[PDB]
């Protein structure tokens, strides 16, 4: 027999992701970059592979629209809301959609994507929202103008208390 | 930091239902009878009570749809999906959907509804699918033709892990 884990959590390590559509504001390459640092933030402190599929039914499935685009969440135009994901589970589970209302960047004139994205996945991946300041998952959105990203503490602790470190090497 | 933490079993032993709607397929008293019966397959084996409520919310709620229904889970017509259900918890919770798309009868001529909710109440009460081929947990629906219904020992030994013994 089975029953259901204690938290909402991928019960594999091998992920599957599909960018659907893209944003007017970035090329398709700087989104593909974008994201992809943004998954490699969390395979780098847990065992999760990422592991991108180019059409088909994907873990989390990454799309960008505007107002109603076909959950319970309509985003609301430029400003306010900027993006969610859905936790762990069937069929939308893990999914994050961006808001096309906003401008979405690979610098910091406007929303930076990767770090918007990085946020978002954690979501995908089954963390809430924090409430240390100085978490990734602190649902304000911050760019410290500094070159090389960290992965705060916080977060680290978060993600390992569901999959684990992976290779703490 | 903070996870999504999930309910693994219901916190109290007497849980509540309701039937919101019913299928073409079968009458009013032959699905209150299957669903009646799907939850004392669980009940005779744990210390759990069910009752039914005729309006207002309840712990298990218990609809028949189509395709889009109103969770973004959709049912896909004749075939394929059959049914699901929610995880222990608060709102969305232990409810039960089943696909009228599908045919549902008393007996065999199609999908038996009484099996069908006793396997996704199981999921309601918190069971995850057995890879026991024997078990009730097991995703493959299969119909003895027998008159009698006795829970497999896997399913009970599953569903006491969370709520122990009658
Ligand atoms: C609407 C959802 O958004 C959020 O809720 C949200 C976003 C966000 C971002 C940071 C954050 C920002 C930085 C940072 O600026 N790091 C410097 C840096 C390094 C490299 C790049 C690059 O390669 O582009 C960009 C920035 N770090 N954190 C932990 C912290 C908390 C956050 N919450
Ligand atoms: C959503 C898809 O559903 C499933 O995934 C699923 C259904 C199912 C049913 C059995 C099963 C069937 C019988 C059986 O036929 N029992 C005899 C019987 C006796 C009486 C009645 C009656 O009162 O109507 C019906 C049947 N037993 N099991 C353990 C086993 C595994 C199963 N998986
Ligand atoms: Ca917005
Ligand atoms: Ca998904
Ligand atoms: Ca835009
Ligand atoms: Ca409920
Ligand atoms: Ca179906
Ligand atoms: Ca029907
Ligand atoms: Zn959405
Ligand atoms: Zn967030
Ligand atoms: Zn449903
Ligand atoms: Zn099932």
């Known amino acids: 027999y089975n029953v259901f884990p204690r938290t909402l959590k991928w019960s594999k390590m091998n992920?599957?992701?599909r960018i659907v559509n893209y944003?007017?504001?970035?090329?398709?390459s700087e989104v593909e970059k974008a994201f992809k640092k943004a998954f490699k933030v969390w395979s780098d402190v847990t065992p999760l592979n990422f592991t991108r599929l180019h059409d088909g039914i994907a873990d989390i499935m990454i799309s960008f629209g505007i107002?109603?685009?076909?959950?319970?969440?309509?985003?609301?135009?430029?400003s306010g809301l900027l993006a969610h994901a859905f936790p762990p589970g069937p069929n939308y589970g893990g999914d994050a959609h961006?808001?096309?209302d906003e401008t979405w960047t690979s610098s910091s004139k406007g929303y930076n994507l990767f770090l918007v994205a990085a946020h978002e996945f954690g979501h995908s991946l089954g963390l809430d929202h924090s409430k240390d300041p100085g978490?990734?998952?602190?649902?304000?959105?911050?760019?410290?103008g500094k070159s090389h990203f960290m992965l705060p503490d916080d977060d680290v602790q978060g993600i390992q208390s569901l999959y684990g470190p992976g290779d703490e090497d």
Do not use: N, R, S, V
Not at 23 to 28: F, L, S
Not at 67 to 78: A, I, L, Q, S
């Open 15 to 17: 992920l599957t992701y």
């Open 67 to 78: 107002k109603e685009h076909g959950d319970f969440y309509p985003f609301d135009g430029p």
């Open 23 to 28: 944003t007017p504001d970035m090329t398709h």
């Open 98 to 100: 961006f808001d096309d």
């Open 135 to 144: 978490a990734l998952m602190f649902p304000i959105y911050t760019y410290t």
